[PDB]
Design a protein around this ligand. Structure first.
Ligand SMILES: Cc1cc2nc3c(=O)[nH]c(=O)nc-3n(C[C@H](O)[C@H](O)[C@H](O)COP(=O)(O)OP(=O)(O)OC[C@H]3O[C@@H](n4cnc5c(N)ncnc54)[C@H](O)[C@@H]3O)c2cc1C
Ligand SMILES: Cc1cc2nc3c(=O)[nH]c(=O)nc-3n(C[C@H](O)[C@H](O)[C@H](O)COP(=O)(O)OP(=O)(O)OC[C@H]3O[C@@H](n4cnc5c(N)ncnc54)[C@H](O)[C@@H]3O)c2cc1C
Ligand SMILES: CN(C)c1nc(NCCc2ccc3ccccc3c2)nc2c1cc(C(=O)N(CCCCN)CC(N)=O)n2CCC(N)=O
Lengths: 488, 490
């Protein structure tokens, strides 16, 4: 008697719109894809495309690229580009519109996909399990709410991604998350980004860019230094060049309460004791698995660490026929990984040859101004595992930044080796054009690459990149996981 | 053997000549002498302390090209909300030229400082020419009959005089200019013919383009059908498109025949197709002869020929046993990170006593036009005639930033050339923004024998122009035995 659908994917995400499209076209199995909304926009935010196309990195980088202009219009003067530059402030209006046009360009492009592909079905609403083989689609995350559709399936994939995490404090209602920020009407004059994640730091740089003439962006981390887990030396070099943009970072400082004001402002109590009136208060304080209202309890698939769906090597949950990927698994909160995990799922089940995604030596980026590329492990972690760690480093001020007046801007490179055999463990880069370089580095590292491989390679002059192959001498080492200056 | 004044003389403070001079003077402690023709950058000799790559080469070029790119990244800002008076946006050439004369004349001072701060590495200011296998005489002028200042007595000699812009070889060449005179022009040129299809005329075509005074144009001009001889076909086509966009008339199959000054001062240019047009300037970027024609290598039994290319073996050792040559005057590969690598290999050879030969192959080049290009390895065409079964992976698109910019014609082209036999990457070719940065890290993967099966099993970075290198799994076409097909005849 078999069954009606072969698969039903919960979430039209980076991770779900791989898994479906691969099962429907490259294995011709019947697929349903459940997602809450047609196209981007409040109040559902996340749409067809996922949380990295609508309220993700696609719109993020567009606004960041716009925010890069402030610098490049300031700098221009030194190369003889004579300009008004006495009241040149931008227009947040025309950016968000042009940004929407493009997210909306993608929103309608993916619909064409369903209509024009046989065996690939859209089902609008909230997904929810009733049993191992039954996925009820409703109007609300509420379970007493109305059954729009009832899908009958052999397999269930879960790809519902993240949802940004809240402070749970007085006046927490008056603050905003990443989502809300993409759909603000004006450019906050007085601005506060809370947190120290890529989430925040990027958004600082954005808001920093679109200031009405006079007005500011305060950062706020509850710890000592911004960007937990990144290269400590790099994290510092950033906090300075952030400072030079105008961004006032503050540290070991947490809000205690917010309240709304006379003119709709937000009065903010701090942990230190100071009180200020900002126009907007962004909580960029990480994000968490969205596994609450799927009723996994009902079908009996384990969750745990902040509701993260528990999965084996191969993305298989505690019920054999249920699977999970992307951010709800909680393995890496990224777009390119959620994809890979989902492509590996189809190769495993419908594919034929079992496979599970390789989560390490993942080249990453943060689009700060100026931006960071990092792949592999920090000297801090390297010291813990490997016998002998060697640590190369170099830093310099690119040629243009002599003429450009931005004398502070500097490029910084930090390579980390296993001295046991002279193999590369991590590569950490700050400066403009970084994340472009880390990608093609990230390939060499995947193969397995020694510092001798790097310094045995002729340069591309003149570029920021060529100091990858001009780093021969180590700056210090680690033995027993303890810092040194030569091998004893 | 016999006790000499210096251990090593070097003719030219080049990228090569200064790498050799320094490594010998500190890590092997020899008494080195380095000859060059002037204090600092500028006319009439241009090339100075720091080589034909810091004074009238790569460095100051790539500043001016960063300076040109701000034309695009201004009328491009408009779409991101950057409303600004673009009314009569006339850029000041003088302030860019000013800015760079300050920057170069600081690397020049910073070279003086290392010389006078370094144990027995001496600088000698003149035209250094050979007297015998152990002698180098330094004259005030390039003419042999010119006054003598020094006569260096040495065990070894090194030739690092590099290259020199080649003449057009046609009446009216006296009225033209080269790379050299361009860096030191008083005003920016209104009507500009950039003559030649080398990477140097191309890069320089943007300079006059970006910095063209209002109501002015630039024409590129070349011998053949497709500019940048020897780069990837599909790149060279797709580039010329965007030079058109940028606002450049690329007129191929053209070659000026005669030039004659006018009344105002502009240049009246008889073309090869019986055409006549007027230009305020005419810059030739047609080639680089090795620069050996006044060193008297004949006189020391050093063998020249092949344009002036000093004849050298797999370890840089010339026809004479104590004399060596490196950089552009050798005429192997004419990049700067080669001249340097040819230098420090030469010190490991002679003074190190653990010989090493410089490798000229799988060397990543890059061209700084607008947009730029990054290329390492061999072109589809060359590779199909070395291999049973080549396989051309290809991809191209418009970025996110141009989606909203307006210049939605802009593209980022990535073509991977593999040997189908074993899927090993014989060559990568890239157009578009941030290319030369990405290729540098790619040239490392290829030097480790990169296979395609490595590229598309490495997780990507979202969202980046580069990430499309790992996205390519399906080959566009193949080349079964030197002839393009559409699938392998299996
Ligand atoms: C501001 C921001 C910037 C980012 N920048 C980057 C970056 O630069 N690079 C990078 O690699 N990663 C980035 N990320 C991370 C990346 O966006 C995510 O890791 C990725 O989108 C997760 O894909 P996914 O398959 O897990 O599902 P998601 O992308 O989260 O998609 C989930 C979607 O499925 C649907 N859905 C969700 N819940 C349910 C439910 N209960 N029932 C039914 N349908 C549901 C909704 O339509 C929702 O939009 C960023 C994230 C954010 C928030
Ligand atoms: C416009 C332009 C752009 C370039 N762009 C790039 C690029 O992007 N990337 C790249 O890798 N390469 C580039 N190059 C080439 C590079 O800059 C150098 O020319 C070369 O790579 C280094 O050669 P060299 O070591 O012989 O140096 P050179 O500088 O050529 O050494 C010779 C120097 O010695 C002196 N000298 C010359 N003749 C005599 C003599 N008879 N007696 C005494 N002293 C003498 C002069 O100062 C002369 O400059 C470019 C060149 C030009 C002209
Ligand atoms: C090969 N591939 C991975 C995909 N191809 C296509 N269409 C045909 C593309 C193509 C290009 C060159 C080819 C050369 C030789 C043979 C076949 C080719 C097919 N649509 C694809 C697609 C992946 C997808 C797809 O699902 N995504 C495409 C994301 C691209 C964003 N720039 C989102 C995802 N699931 O990861 N889509 C959706 C259509 C679209 N462009 O919106």
């Amino acid at each position: 008697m078999s069954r009606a659908y072969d698969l039903v994917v919960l979430g039209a995400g980076s991770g779900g719109l791989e898994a479906g499209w691969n099962a429907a076209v490259t294995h011709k199995k019947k697929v349903a894809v459940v997602d809450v909304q047609a196209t981007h926009g409040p109040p559902l935010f996340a749409a067809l495309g996922g949380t990295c196309v609508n309220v993700g990195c696609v719109p993020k980088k567009l606004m960041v690229t716009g925010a890069q202009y402030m610098d490049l219009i300031r700098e221009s003067g030194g190369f003889g580009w004579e300009m008004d530059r006495e009241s040149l402030c931008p227009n947040w209006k025309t950016l968000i519109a042009a940004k929407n046009k493009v997210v909306n360009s993608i929103n309608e492009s993916y619909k064409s996909m369903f209509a024009d592909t046989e065996g690939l079905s859209f089902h609008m609403g909230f997904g929810a399990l009733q049993d191992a083989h039954t996925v009820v689609v409703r109007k609300s995350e509420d379970p007493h709410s109305d059954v729009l559709e009832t899908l009958d399936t052999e397999y269930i994939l879960i790809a519902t991604g993240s949802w940004p995490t809240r402070l749970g404090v007085p006046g927490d209602e008056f603050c905003i998350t990443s989502n809300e920020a993409f759909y603000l009407e004006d450019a906050p004059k007085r601005m506060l980004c809370v947190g120290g994640g890529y989430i925040a730091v990027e958004f600082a740089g954005i808001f920093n860019g679109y200031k009405p003439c006079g007005g500011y962006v305060d950062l706020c981390y509850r710890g000592d230094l911004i960007l937990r887990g990144f290269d400590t030396e790099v994290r510092k070099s950033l906090t300075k060049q952030l400072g030079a943009n105008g961004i006032r970072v503050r540290t070991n400082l947490n809000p205690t309460k917010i309240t709304k004001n006379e003119d709709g402002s937000n009065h903010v109590h701090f942990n230190d004791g100071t009180e200020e009136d900002y126009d907007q208060v962004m909580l960029a304080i990480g994000r968490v698995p969205r596994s609450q209202a799927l009723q996994l309890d009902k079908a009996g698939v384990r969750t745990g660490k902040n509701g993260a769906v528990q999965v084996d090597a191969y993305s298989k949950t505690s019920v054999d026929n249920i699977y999970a990927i992307g951010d709800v698994t909680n393995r890496v909160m990224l777009t390119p990984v959620a994809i890979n995990e989902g492509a590996a799922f189809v190769e495993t089940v419908f594919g034929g040859k079992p496979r599970a995604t390789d989560h390490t030596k993942v080249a990453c980026a943060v689009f700060s101004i100026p931006p960071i590329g990092t792949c592999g492990m920090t000297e801090e972690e390297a010291a813990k595992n490997y016998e002998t760690v060697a640590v190369y480093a170099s830093s310099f001020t690119p040629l243009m930044h002599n003429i450009s007046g931005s004398k502070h801007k500097e490029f910084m490179i930090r390579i980390i080796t296993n001295e046991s055999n002279g193999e590369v463990l991590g590569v950490h880069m700050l400066g403009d054009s970084a994340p472009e370089i880390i990608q093609s580095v990230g390939i060499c590292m995947k193969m397995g690459a020694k510092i001798s491989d790097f310094h045995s390679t002729i340069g591309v002059h003149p570029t920021s990149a060529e100091e990858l192959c001009s780093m021969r001498t180590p700056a210090y080492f680690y033995e027993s996981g303890k810092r040194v200056e030569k091998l004893s």
